[PDB]
Design a protein around this ligand. Structure first.
Ligand SMILES: NC(=[NH2+])c1ccc2[nH]c(-c3ncccc3[O-])nc2c1
Ligand SMILES: [Ca+2]
Ligand SMILES: [Cl-]
Length: 223
């Protein structure tokens, strides 16, 4: 997260860290045994870490659970990143409390101007790499579809939306991929891609979760 602030320990209880010996992506807890992340964060050997704040120190509240399976959307296209969403089922259910909690799926899509909270342990520099130990937060608005398509002509599908600041300076970045974009208490986006991080007129692009709620429900119901 570039231009963000320190969230405060466990103030984002649905945030998870995907770990394979180091933090490589974020995710969101949607029920006690399932996490939603981005399809491009897929790899084998994933351990899901819940209740984290400092990812390099065991401070208490952490729950480390291995992924039993990861389900990449069947129509995920790695070249356009269209359908960039993945579901991870945990080997055991997590103990939910006030520090580890799930986030609700939306019943409707959010509109331009909605203010959302994006969080993660990704890079904090637009020019270079500084990776934080604690969780960073950023409040950013959803942009109109015309500004998003004007910024990335021919690359935005209906399963994507832009959020951020065209002036540059505040944005999600590498390491934040797969993490949450929460607006009014509902999970509306998943950190997916962008051109560099916090560059002027190049906002972040997010997977539009309201378009996948029936797919998530049906897939969880059959697995
Ligand atoms: N500017 C952004 N909002 C952004 C967000 C997530 C990203 N993830 C990546 C990324 N970069 C290199 C390898 C994997 C990634 O997910 N770039 C990213 C850029
Ligand atoms: Ca920790
Ligand atoms: Cl277009």
């Amino acid at each position: 997260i570039v231009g963000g602030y320190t969230c405060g320990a466990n103030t984002v209880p649905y945030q998870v860290s995907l770990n394979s010996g180091y933090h490589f992506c974020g995710g969101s807890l949607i029920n006690s045994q399932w996490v939603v992340s981005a399809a491009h964060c897929y790899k084998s050997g994933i351990q899901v870490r819940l209740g984290e704040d400092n990812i390099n120190v065991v401070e208490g509240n952490e729950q480390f659970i291995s992924a039993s399976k990861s389900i990449v959307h069947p129509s995920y296209n790695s070249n356009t990143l269209n359908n960039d969403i993945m579901l991870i089922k945990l080997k055991s259910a997590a103990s939910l409390n006030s520090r580890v909690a799930s986030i609700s799926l939306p019943t409707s899509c959010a509109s331009a101007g909605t203010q959302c909270l994006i969080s993660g342990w990704g890079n904090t520099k637009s020019s270079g790499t500084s990776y934080p130990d604690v969780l960073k937060c950023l409040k950013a608005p959803i942009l109109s579809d015309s500004s998003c398509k004007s910024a990335y002509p021919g690359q935005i599908t209906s399963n994507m939306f832009c959020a951020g600041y065209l002036e540059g300076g505040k944005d999600s970045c590498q390491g934040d991929s797969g993490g949450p974009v929460v607006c009014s208490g509902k999970l509306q986006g998943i950190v997916s891609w962008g051109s560099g991080c916090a560059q002027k007129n190049k906002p972040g692009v997010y997977t539009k979760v309201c378009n996948y709620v029936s797919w998530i429900k049906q897939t969880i119901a059959s697995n």
